[model samples]
Each structure stands twice: as structure tokens, then as C-alpha cells.
Target: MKILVTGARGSIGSRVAGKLVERGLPVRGGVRDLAAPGLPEGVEAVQADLTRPETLARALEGVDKVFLYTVPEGIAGFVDEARAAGVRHVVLLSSIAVTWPDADRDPIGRMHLAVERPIEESGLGWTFVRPEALATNALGWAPEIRGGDMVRCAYPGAYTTPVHEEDIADVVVAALTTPGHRSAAYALTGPETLTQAEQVALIGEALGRAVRCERMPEQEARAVLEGLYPAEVVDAILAGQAARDGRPAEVLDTIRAVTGRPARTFREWAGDHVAAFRPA
Candidate 1:
């Protein structure tokens, strides 16, 4: 089956495309710019944006399946175009927040659901790979760690299961290539839980040095985060962290359940990307 992987330049999507290429499967990698580089050796790069309808037709051409991202706007047009192209399946990289008790009230969950609803109604086989707090989130701390011995952040005690990007990619690839995964929603997480402070410590371990997490006051954190994200997203993140403080996050075996391999730990994730924490 020929697969169209949108957002193929992303951490998970790039791995998915590369894995497909490794299996010698036909893979069409979608990007916003056809001129951009770094697609896998054997995959075709096509310009496609989920929020733009005009690009979908060419990207969907002769593609039987799609690895989709959560772009809510213009999803209806994408569905129409995919149906026109005879696309049969879609595996979405979604947020685990959608399964929470207050999903409708959660901005992140609602955002993912907006894209999911349309695909559910599109008469296409679909799977939603919903990953909990991604380990890559720690990458945002790279500069701080790289620059000094201390990391500054709020809610140092907030607990989370920082799922590895590779694990998420494996599950997505499984959903794309396997049969039992169709119409399924898999919530994925790391094998172990750790507080935000503990995660920073692990980074120090990877770097063979000491790094401390200095808790910033909530107001100070909000101001810093606001510059990086929308106010709503910043509010949600801070609120979620506060709620999770001193509480261990839920851990699931969905990675092994789907990919038949144990979920990678946060330590392993830190090790894999340790170079980012080092100076040039």
C-alpha cells in the first residue's frame, strides 16, 4: 500500500517515513515546501498543507493511506480530496488529552478532536495514536542546560510520563501497516514516570554533569511561556502541571501492545539526544 505521510519533516513523521522506506514500502512524504530538503532517500516529497485545500489533491494522488497530523482547519476539504483520490486509511498523531475526563474543556484535547471528528466521518479507516507528554518537550530546556548548571522552570514537582518520540513513531507505523489497529485509539506513554525536576536530573546524568531545576514562580513562568505559546496553551500547560504536581502520571503498555517492544524510558530518550545539551 502506498502511504502519504503529512508532516514528514517532524520528529515522529520523519521516523515513520524512514521506517517505511526501510521496509521498502512506497511512501509519499508531505511537506509545506517541495524545495525543502532532508526527506529519506527512497521517499517522494510532495508539498501538502492540511490547512490548505489546493495542495491536498496532488499530495493525495495515487496514495492509498495517510499518516496525518492534527490541523483542524480545512480538514473537510482534505477528507473530500482524499476520498476523491481513493485513499483508504489515515493514522493520526493526536494528543492523549482527548481521553481525559475533561477533554471538551481541555484546549489541547479539543484541538485534536476537531481533526479527528472529520476523519471519523470521512468513510476512511482511521487510527488515532494519542501520546502523553512527549519526552521531546524537554528539548526546550536544551539552551538552559547547555548554557549553565541550572535549569529554571515552574512546577518542578509536576509528574509526567514523557513518551519517547521513537516509540510514538513505532506505534504510528504499526497502525499504518497492520490490520488490527484500524479504528483504534492507542494512548501511549513512557514505561516510567518522573517529576519535572527528576527529568532535569536525568539530563545531567546523560551529560555527566550536575544540572539543577530552579523553580520559577508561577507568574514569572507564565510570562516566559506566554512569549513561546499562545496564552490559552500556556494557561493549560501551567494548570495541568499544577494538577499533576506530586502525582505520578499514568503509564501504559500501549507501545509494546502495538509495536511488540517495551516502551523506552525517559533516561534512554535523554541519552539519545544528549549531544543537544553539550556546548559546540
Candidate 2:
């Protein structure tokens, strides 16, 4: 089936669109600028903005399914346009944060749910691919690994199952093309659980060097994170990290369950992207 992948410029969406093209499916990549470069070679690019749902009409043309990113505003208009264009299925790129014990109070969960809840109620076939921690999050440590002997970790002992982005894309592609996944909410995770410190060691191994994780104080990490988000968001994220590191995290076999292969390990992920951490 023909599909339109929103946020195609993003890491996950771009990978999803590329994989769909590899499978010989007609894929349209929704971007804010049709002139933008770097989308997969066979995928068509259409100008569409989540905040401006009017642009979706052109993007949705002849597209039977969609791989979606969450955008809270203008959700009604987006759903309306999708239905009007006769789109049948929508696979959402969501977060496992929504399943947290306090999701009702988690701003990140609420933000994603704002978009998710409406699409579910819109009489559309839907699948939610909720990934816990993305393996790509380690990219943030590239500078430190490339230039120093140690990686500064905000929560060294924090446990997480960091799923590879490709695994997430595989699940999304399966949901868009297959039938049994409709109305299913898959909580995806990496194949194994590991601490931030352990993850750093894996990165070091991938780079053929020994790199250590230097745990930073919460207040100091808070100061660093504050520049990236609002204070409230910063605080809430720190709290999650503290709790995430407090115990061993759970993992899912969804990668194998959906793709027939085990989810890739962090070392494998780090090896694939080792160039990003290579010293100049």
C-alpha cells in the first residue's frame, strides 16, 4: 500500500520511509519544504506541517496509510484531512513514557496522548509503536567520547533498554503494511537492560578504546539540561532518570516478535555509528 510518512526529515521517519522504499512500496515523505534534500531517493516529498493540517491534503493524495509523529495542535484538522483523503491506517511514533506509573502527571506522556487519543477516536485503523529509550540518545555523548577519556553521564546507574531506531522503523513498517497490528499498542524496547555506565563501556568497546562514565551531580546535570528545556521539563526529566537508574529496566521481544530477529545490542548500535564518536 502507498504510505505517507510525516516528519520524514526526522531520524526515525526518514529511516521508515527509506525502508518502505526498499520494500518497493510507494512512499511519500511529508516535509515542511518540498525543496529540502536528503529524503530517500525513491520517496516523493510533499510539503506538510503538523501544525498546519491544510498541507496534509496534498501529502495524503493516493496514500492509503501513514506513519505519524505527534503534534498536539491542529490534531482535529489533521484527522479530518486524513479521513477526507480516504487514508485507512495510521501508525503513531509514540513514547513508552506514556506507560509510566504517573503518566497522568507526566507532561511528556500528556503531550503525546493529546495527539494519540484523537486519532484513536477518529474511526481509523491505528497502531502505536511506543519505544522506551532510543539507542540514538547516546549520540549526545559523542563530543565527550571523541575528545576525552570519559563520558559525563547524568545518571550513570540508571537502567534503560535502549532500542535501535531501525527496530522501531521495522515495527512501524510492519504495522503499516500488515493487517494484524491494527489497534495494537506495542511497547518496544531494546533486547537487553543496561546501566548508563555499562552503555558507555560498550561505546568504548565499539571505538576500540576504554571510556568511562563520570557520573555528574543532579544539580549540575540539571544546569546542563536546563538550556535544552523549560525548568519544569528539566526537573521532571531528572526525576525520571533518577528513578530509571534505581532498578533494572524491563525489555521486550517485540523486535523479534515483529521482525523475526533479535533486537540489536547497544554495542552493535555503537559500532554502526562509531564514526560519529571517532576522534578528529
Candidate 3:
């Protein structure tokens, strides 16, 4: 089967594309540009930006399945275009925020739900992978780690089951290649829940150093993330963190249920990406 992976150069998309290629499937990588490094070998790269509707026709020409990353701009029309192009299956990379009743209040959730609704109504086979906080989110501390052992962020006690990118990719691969996963919505999360402070310490353990997380006020946190993220996204992230550290910490067995294997722990995830925390 021919599969097209949008955002193929991104953390999860790149890994998913590589896995598909490893399985001897024909894969086409949809990238905004071909010059980006770390793309998997033996996969064709097609220039297709989700925001540009006119550029998508060729990318969807012979694609049987698609692994989509939520792109807010022109996604309302993507499902119809995919059907017109004869695409059979579509797997979307959604977020755990969608589980919230007030999804429209959160910018990221709004964008994901916007795309999800159209896909669900498209009369096509669909799968949605709702991942919790990503292990890659720790990359935000790369600069601090490379410079010192201190990572600054808000809500040190904020907890989450930070899912690994590779695990997400594995699930995506299953959805793309298998049949039973159709019309399914899977909430993928890591094996263990850890506080932000504990996660930093785990990274320190992996790097053989004493890494610590510094608490910042919510106002400061908002200031730090202001230009980097939308206001609603900033609010949602902070809210989730607070909820994680509050009365009810969300945890689920969906990963094991869907994939028949335990999800990797934050410690394992930290060890795998230790280089990012290493001094240059």
C-alpha cells in the first residue's frame, strides 16, 4: 500500500515514515521543504504544505493511506480532497486535550477538533491517536541542559505520563497498516506518571548529573511562552499541568491495550535522548 506521511520531517512523522519504509511499504513523505535533514531513506519526498490547498493534489494522487498532523489552515477541505484522490485510510495525530469538554476554548484542541470532525464525516476509514504530553516536550529544556544543570519552568510538581515519540509512531503504523483500528480513538500515554521536577531529575540521572527544575510563577511562565505559543494554548498547557498536580492525575492503560506492550517510562525516554542533555 502506498502511504503518505504529512509533516514527515517532524519528530513523530519522521519516525512513522521510517517504520513504514522498514516494513517494505511504499511511503511518500510530505514535507514543506526537501532540504530538511534526518528524513528516512528510500521514501519519496513531496512538497505539500497543509496551508496550501492547491499543492496537495499531487501528494494525494496515488496515496492509499495518510498519517496527518493537524494543520489548521486548510484542513476542512483535506478529507474531501483525500477521498477524491482515492485515499482509503487516514490516521490523525490528535492531542489529549480533545478529551476535555471545552475543547473549543483551547486553541490547539480547537484546531484538532476542527480537523477531526471533517475527517469523521468524510465517509472514509479513520483513526485518531490522542497522545498525552510528549517526551520530546523536554527538548524545551535543551538549552538549559547544554548550559547548566538547571531547567526553569512553572509548576514543578506538575505531573504527566510523557509518551515517547517512537511509541506514538508504532501505534500510528498499526493504525495505518491494520484493519481493526479503523474508527478507533486511542489515548496513548507512557508507562509512568512523574512530576516535572522528577522528570528533570530523571534526565539528570540519565546524563549522570544533578539536573533540577526551578519553579516559575504562572505569569512568568505565560510571559516565557507568549510569542512561542498562542494564548489559548498557553492557557491549556498551564491548566493541564495544574490538573496533573491537583486532586486527579490522569493515567490510562490504552497504550498496552492497543499495542499489547507496556509503554516506555519517562526514565527510559530520558536515557534514549540523553545526548540532548549533554554538554556540547
Clashes in candidate 2: how many? 1
**What TM-score should be assigned to candidate 2?**
0.97
Inter-residue clash pairs, candidate 1 = none
- For residues 144-211, what per-residue lDDT tens digits would candidate 3 score against the true structure? 98899888888888888899998999999999987799999998878877888888999999998899
Model 2 lDDT vs. the true structure? 0.89
Q: Best-fitting candidate, measured by lDDT?
A: 1
Residue 8 in candidate 2, Cα distance off native in Å? 1.6
What would the per-residue lDDT of candidate 1 be over residues 1-280, giving only the tens digit for each residue?
A: 5899999988888999999999889999999988888777788999889889789998888899999989888788888998899988889999999999888888898999888888888898899999999999999999999999898879999999999999988998888887888789999999998999999999999999989998999989999999999998998999999999999989899999888899999999999999999987
Descending-lDDT candidate ranking: 1, 2, 3
Ranking by TM-score: 1, 2, 3
Number of the top-ranking candidate, with TM-score as the measure: 1
Better model by TM-score, 1 or 2?
1
Whole-model Cα lDDT per candidate? Answer: 0.91, 0.89, 0.86
Candidate 1: Cα lDDT at 242:
93
Steric clashes per prediction: 0, 1, 0
Expressed as tens digits, the lDDT of each residue in 131-249 for candidate 2 is 99899999999999889879887889999999998899999999987779989998999989999999999999998899999889887898899998888788778888888876989
TM-score of 3: 0.95
